[PDB]
């Protein structure tokens, strides 16, 4: 019982760490997507 308890605690901690990781990468990707699309739009508008 003790060992299972400790392992669950560690699992929770690793989950939190991975959550941080994913959140950071998500922010980066959202920024990149916005950049790409706005560049597309401005180029297309500049076409005329």
């Amino acid at each position: 019982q003790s060992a299972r308890m400790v392992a669950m605690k560690a699992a929770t901690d690793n989950a939190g760490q991975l959550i941080k990781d994913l959140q950071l990468i998500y922010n980066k990707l959202r920024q990149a997507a916005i950049t790409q699309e706005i560049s597309e739009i401005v180029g297309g508008a500049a076409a005329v």
Binding site: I41, A45, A47
Partner: protein, 463 residues
């Protein structure tokens, strides 16, 4: 006072006219060399116009004279088109000789007015288990078919065609919109061997023609359906007609193609800003009226199974049901192979369907979705370690899946082409009994590939 070819770039065409004589929008322009025709898109002043080529894009010479008709695009309509396949221009493409009628009508009428909406919602039944229980239809409705590539979707539409034809003198009509012409020919011949073409009219846009043609096939089919509905027969009310869209997405893409070359700026995805305008123009001319109604079926394609972008988003704001086909249920050997858990309709309402049918649908949703989420743990341990509770649930879910297996009326060769078209009430009875457990003592196989309780019991007794 004839215009001339002044500039051509790909799909966009321009013509000079005498400033006094100026064509109006949406009127046909006659190439004085070839049969090819031009539609006005916008007036460029000074007698200059912008147009799109209806037909081939060959044989074109800067400075070739072109004339007009000073009138919108009108094509023949009437019973003299049934069982015939026409081009975007309404010409015989089936080599069955010219059309017989001269009843020609334009294609850009306005949407039906507000005051003339059918003052009451209606319902349509198909005699099909999963649909008439979980995907109800309103006569005049809007239906979407998403995905499905391991099964014959055209088989499903043709089944619905036989459904409506035997169900009503209300004829049917299909329009080829970016048609995978292999499947189109297959459908043509299979309807042919069905001997059912008298209630069918055919126009094809088959991924080989300037984008305008594939744009406008939709309008053609719309016009045919409109007029055919408007033929008030012996009573003052014509038949309620059915439409088949080869793909709405290709209708969107047709305008999407040359929008930028039109001088249109791109949209949020780079699309055409007039997307919603044309979409509504299309849909609002598809309704139920005070006298008669028109409904349609739309074969839907989804890009990368992604719905979270405008191209399906706009469509969804006009449908009434989202029939999403299922592949692995087909792998389960199910004939219809339609998902029972994702497909919905806005028509699922007790006030319109009654209470009992609605609540039966509720219960079956609950049991199926609960059975799904236990799959993992069942795999991990087995049925035994689960409480005795939900064992009957598993059995009932399996029997439900079997009950959904509906032999097709018209395949001509899948199980003998047997029709079921079971009444909604009988299926209600059967599913009510199954939910209660009236027959939760029989192997699910007895519920497989059959219809009502009579067939299930007879099968269980014969084995």
């Amino acid at each position: 006072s004839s215009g001339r070819i002044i500039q051509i770039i790909g799909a966009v065409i321009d013509v000079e006219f005498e400033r006094t004589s100026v064509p109006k929008i949406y009127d046909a322009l006659q190439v004085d060399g070839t049969e090819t025709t031009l539609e006005v898109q916008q007036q460029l002043g000074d007698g200059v116009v912008r147009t799109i080529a209806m037909g081939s894009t060959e044989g074109l010479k800067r400075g070739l004279t072109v004339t007009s008709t000073n009138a919108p695009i009108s094509v023949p309509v009437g019973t003299a088109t049934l069982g015939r396949i026409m081009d975007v221009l309404g010409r015989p493409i089936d080599e069955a000789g010219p059309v017989a009628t001269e009843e020609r009508l334009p294609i850009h009428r306005q949407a039906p007015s507000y005051a003339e909406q059918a003052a009451s919602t209606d319902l349509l039944e198909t005699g099909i288990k999963v649909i008439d229980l979980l995907c109800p239809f309103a006569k005049g409705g809007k239906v979407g078919l998403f995905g499905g590539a391991g099964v014959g979707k055209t088989v499903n539409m043709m089944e619905l065609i036989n459904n409506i034809a035997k169900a009503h003198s209300g004829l049917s009509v299909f329009a080829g919109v970016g048609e995978r012409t292999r499947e189109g020919n297959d459908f043509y011949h299979e309807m042919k061997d069905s001997n059912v073409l008298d209630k069918v009219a055919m126009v094809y846009g088959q991924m080989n023609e300037p984008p305008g043609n594939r744009l406008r096939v939709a309008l053609t089919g719309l016009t045919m359906a409109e007029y055919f509905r408007d033929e008030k027969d012996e009573n003052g009310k014509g038949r309620d007609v059915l439409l088949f869209v080869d793909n709405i997405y290709r209708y969107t893409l047709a305008g999407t193609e040359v929008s930028a070359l039109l001088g249109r700026m791109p949209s949020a995805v780079g699309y055409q800003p007039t997307l919603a305008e044309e979409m509504g123009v299309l849909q609002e001319r598809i309704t139920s009226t005070k006298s008669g109604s028109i409904t349609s079926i739309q074969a839907v394609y989804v890009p990368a199974d992604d719905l979270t972008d405008p191209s399906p988003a706009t469509t969804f704001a006009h449908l009434d049901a989202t029939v999403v086909l299922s592949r692995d249920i087909a792998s389960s050997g199910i004939y219809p192979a339609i998902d029972p858990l994702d497909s919905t309709s806005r028509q699922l309402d007790p006030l319109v369907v009654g209470q009992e049918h609605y609540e039966i649908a509720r219960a079956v949703q609950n049991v199926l979705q609960r059975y799904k989420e236990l799959k993992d743990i069942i795999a991990i341990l087995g049925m035994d370690e689960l409480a005795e509770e939900d064992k009957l649930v598993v059995y009932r879910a399996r029997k439900i899946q079997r009950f959904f297996s509906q032999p097709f009326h018209v395949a001509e060769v899948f199980t003998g082409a047997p029709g079921k078209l079971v009444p909604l009430k009988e299926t209600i009875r059967g599913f009510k009994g199954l939910l209660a457990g009236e027959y939760d003592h029989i192997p699910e196989q007895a519920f497989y590939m059959v219809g009502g309780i009579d067939e299930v019991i007879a099968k269980a007794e014969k084995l």
